[PDB]
Curated annotation (Swiss-Prot), chain B:
Subcellular location: Nucleus; Chromosome
Effect of substituting I80A: Partial loss of homodimerization. Abolished binding to histone H4 acetylated at 'Lys-12' (H4K12ac)
Residues of the full protein shown: 75 to 186 of 801
Free-text function comment from the UniProt entry: Chromatin reader protein that specifically recognizes and binds histone H4 acetylated at 'Lys-5' and 'Lys-12' (H4K5ac and H4K12ac, respectively), thereby controlling gene expression and remodeling chromatin structures. Recruits transcription factors and coactivators to target gene sites, and activates RNA polymerase II machinery for transcriptional elongation.
Transmembrane segments: none
Name by which UniProt lists this protein: Bromodomain-containing protein 2
Subunit record text: Homodimer. Interacts with E2F1. Interacts with (acetylated) STAT3; promoting STAT3 recruitment to chromatin. Interacts with CTCF; promoting BRD2 recruitment to chromatin.
Additional remark text: Some specific inhibitors of BRD2 that prevent binding to acetylated histone are promising therapeutic molecules for the treatment of cancers or inflammatory diseases. ABBV-744, a small molecule, has been tested on tumors with success: ABBV-744 antiproliferative activity is mainly restricted to cell lines of acute myeloid leukaemia and prostate cancer and is able to displace BRD4 from chromatin. GSK046 (iBET-BD2), which specifically inhibits the second bromo domain, is a promising therapeutic small molecule for the treatment of inflammatory and autoimmune diseases.
Length: 113, 112
């Protein structure tokens, strides 16, 4: 991977805002299905993703383009909607964070460097 | 009309609307037709491409972010309601990946 203007923005603007959010705590590290008591989590969710993993990938220049990082954010949110019950608080928390994600992505620099 | 909304109309909606997996999303979920009796008890804000496309055509959106939230709601509704192993979920995921890919190259500053 490499350092682009967009990936810097995703790291220093988007992720930083999401990371600090009061609903972000369940998403800052990989889902621990045993510790959280989530039955069949890894049988249902085949590509776990979380903001800690994404943050580390940004720090280690893992991504080649902004879209790749955005796809990882999407996977994290989608996993949450797929696995959990519609009425679970975690779904509402993911929706709230995801709206901020899209809002911030809307103002990301247009051409990648 | 803004530069970003034009991009969402001409690039994003254009690509998604004609996609081979788009057909279940081109009109509002008809719970009776599709045999999904609990649909509206679970999904409180239905959304679909036809509605978004109509909104784009009629200059309903004030900002690109608003249109992006409608796309997001459409996909999120699908993941929440349907079973994880349903084909519709795979179709939604495929379309959303294209949505995100294209949104990555959307104009940065919203100018009226
Ligand atoms: C991301 N999480 C973490 C979590 C923590 C507590 C209860 C449920 C969940 N499910 C998820 O999908
Ligand atoms: C958006 N759709 C449309 C659909 C078509 C056929 C079977 C299930 C669904 N569920 C959805 O969430």
């Amino acid at each position: 991977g490499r350092v682009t203007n967009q990936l810097q923005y995703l790291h220093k603007v988007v992720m930083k805002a999401l990371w600090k959010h009061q609903f972000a705590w369940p998403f800052r590290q990989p889902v621990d299905a045993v510790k959280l008591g989530l039955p069949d989590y890894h049988k249902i969710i085949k590509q776990p993703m979380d903001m800690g993993t994404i943050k580390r990938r940004l720090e280690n220049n893992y991504y080649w383009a902004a879209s790749e990082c955005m796809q990882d954010f999407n996977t994290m949110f989608t996993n949450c909607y797929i696995y959990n019950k519609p009425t679970d608080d975690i779904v509402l928390m993911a929706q709230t964070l995801e709206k901020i994600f899209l809002q911030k992505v809307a103002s990301m620099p247009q051409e990648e460097q």
